[PDB]
Design a binder for this molecule. Sequence first.
Ligand SMILES: O=C(CN1C(=O)C2(CCN(C(=O)c3cnc4[nH]ncc4c3)CC2)c2c1ccc(F)c2F)NCC(F)(F)F
Length: 271
Amino acid sequence: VAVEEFPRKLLTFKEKLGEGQFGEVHLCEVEGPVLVAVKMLRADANKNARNDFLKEIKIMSRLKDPNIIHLLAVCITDDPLCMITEYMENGDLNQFLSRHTVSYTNLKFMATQIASGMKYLSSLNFVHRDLATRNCLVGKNYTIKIADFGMSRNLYSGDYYRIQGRAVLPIRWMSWESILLGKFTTASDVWAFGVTLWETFTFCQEQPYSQLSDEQVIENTGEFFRDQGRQTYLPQPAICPDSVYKLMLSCWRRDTKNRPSFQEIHLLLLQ
Ligand SMILES: O=C(CN1C(=O)C2(CCN(C(=O)c3cnc4[nH]ncc4c3)CC2)c2c1ccc(F)c2F)NCC(F)(F)F
């Protein structure tokens, strides 16, 4: 699998969109107003951070859904390395919904767009592992594209926690079995989608399980896996009609064989 090489000379840097530990992301304007996002790899990158970038290119070149971030081109004839995507002028869904009320048809539409992305990824057996409104990108006319910024962003540092032997994980979105056992399946992504839908219908005004703190979020994960009534669920949003709340509670059932598939979730949301 291959991609096209984009003439770097025609890019014109405008703003910085973000920073990882091992690259930048720039909003540029192409000369031949046309703007692209450029994920770069810093010229001074160790073997591991450069090979992971090449692996990132190989995996991104295969992603071909209009709700997943999509690779337009690369710069790899010489350093710095680059990947290109269409600019989304409304930022991440957390930032966009927090700015607002918006039509319920638009919210439900954005949730269906996420579900279509997630069903694509599930069809590739690509478990995304960090779905959240912070990880969605929003463009013209309320369109969505699932992305993956990594845990680097300072703005969302409070959405993440590190278990004593485990790496940092966004525990508030995760299902018990991605916490207690480390098994990230598409079911765990479906539990993620439940929390993400909840953020969409609350306008992300507050962090889920806002009443709790982290060690109580972990003890509550134990209350899910214990399945003895002491688990506490995300409350039903007022904007959210009862049936999509029943889709959400279906995402959060203790056993994965009873959670919905992304294909069925997409079908159900469209009514
Ligand atoms: O897409 C991926 C990983 N990935 C990304 O998340 C990003 C870099 C991190 N993000 C950005 O910097 C950003 C912020 N705000 C933006 N406003 N407008 C465009 C734009 C961009 C999002 C886009 C990205 C990636 C890869 C190549 C890119 F060229 C690129 F831009 N993985 C697929 C999976 F579904 F799993 F998410």
